[PDB]
Amino acid sequence: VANDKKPSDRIAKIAETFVKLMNGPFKDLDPLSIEETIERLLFILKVSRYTLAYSDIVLHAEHNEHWYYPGRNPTEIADGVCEFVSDCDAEVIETDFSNLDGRVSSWMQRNIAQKAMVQAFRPEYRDEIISFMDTIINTTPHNTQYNGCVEFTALTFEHPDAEPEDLFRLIGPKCGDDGLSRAIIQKSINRAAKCFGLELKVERYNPEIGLCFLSRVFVDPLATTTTIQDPLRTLRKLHLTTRDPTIPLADAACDRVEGYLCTDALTPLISDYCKMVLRLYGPTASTEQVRNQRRSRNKEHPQDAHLMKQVLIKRTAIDEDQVDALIGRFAAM
Secondary structure, X not given: OOOOOOOOHHHHHHHHXXXXXHHOOOOOOOOOOHHXXXXXXXXXXXXXXXXXXXXXXXXXXXXXXXXXXXXXXXXHHHHHHHHHHHHOOOOEEEEEEOOOOOOOOHHHHHHHHHHXXXXXXXXXXXXXXXXXXXXXXXXXXHHHHHHHHHHHHHHHHHOOOOOHHHHHOOOOOEEOOEEEEEHHHOOHHHHHHHHHOOOEEEEEOEOOOEEEEOOEEEOXXXXXXXXXXXXXXXXXXXXXXXXXXXXXXXXXXXXXXXHHHHHHOOOOOOHHHHHHHHHHHHHHOOOHHHHHOOHHHHOOOHHHHHHHHHHHHHHHOOOHHHHHHHHHHHHHO
8 A cells, every 4th residue: 555645844854864874984885796696695686686785784884783683693683682671671662563565655765765775875876776766666674774764753753952863872673563662752653653654553561471572572581581482473373374285284384393493492382282283293294305305395491481481371361270271181182
């Protein structure tokens, strides 16, 4: 659903200041060769060749590590999240956007992303990048840029008397559709989204139900960095498999449970399901080398185990006796 909601006059100066702060000290850049882009990490290649270099140079710089979390290993993500929650003393807010790529306006697209790319890249490459942006208007970096712009707008609205550089220095971790911010702008974020024309969903941090971030649940971010898959999103749908019909059910289930072990080995109410899938569909599945040579293969802390159990129960609103009964039923099947 395309939208053409231009922002107000005042917000334009805030957006320009945010873009300039994003530019930082990297005035000049050069495009990457086709071979280097191909070995990095059709239609994706032509934009990737420039966008990967732009991200790696500007968005992964010294003065842009405060907010651009997108682009780091999951261990690095967990470390950053724990550091941010320690800094904010467990006072953080979560942002959940609905169809951001389908809702970003033309003015935002042509005044944030296009401006940033043109300022980052060399003048001799202006035509190619502008043509690529025009083709885009009619991937990953766009969401991060939108999140950074919205964070800058919120910070500018919260403290209009501070210098833009100091305001932007407080930008918290942001990664695409998910991000973190101070809880003091919980109500003012909705007005900023309305001014830009975006829809924002915000939820106050609650230790009883855990914290939601990148479909990951932090059981107790104050002390431990233990983290698990989001139970709210996956439990209601994990019993149904959305793989293509051509794949046997056993191979898809095996890949799903292998990923779950790789990410959620010691999570209550999921380990039992994964083990029962491995016990039932496991022997009936095909050879694992066969599925490793098949395209659809990629189409999918012990100390606080008690606390993780209680946090999962709080997340799923299931009584402990009910949880034990469910665990017994799952294991005995």
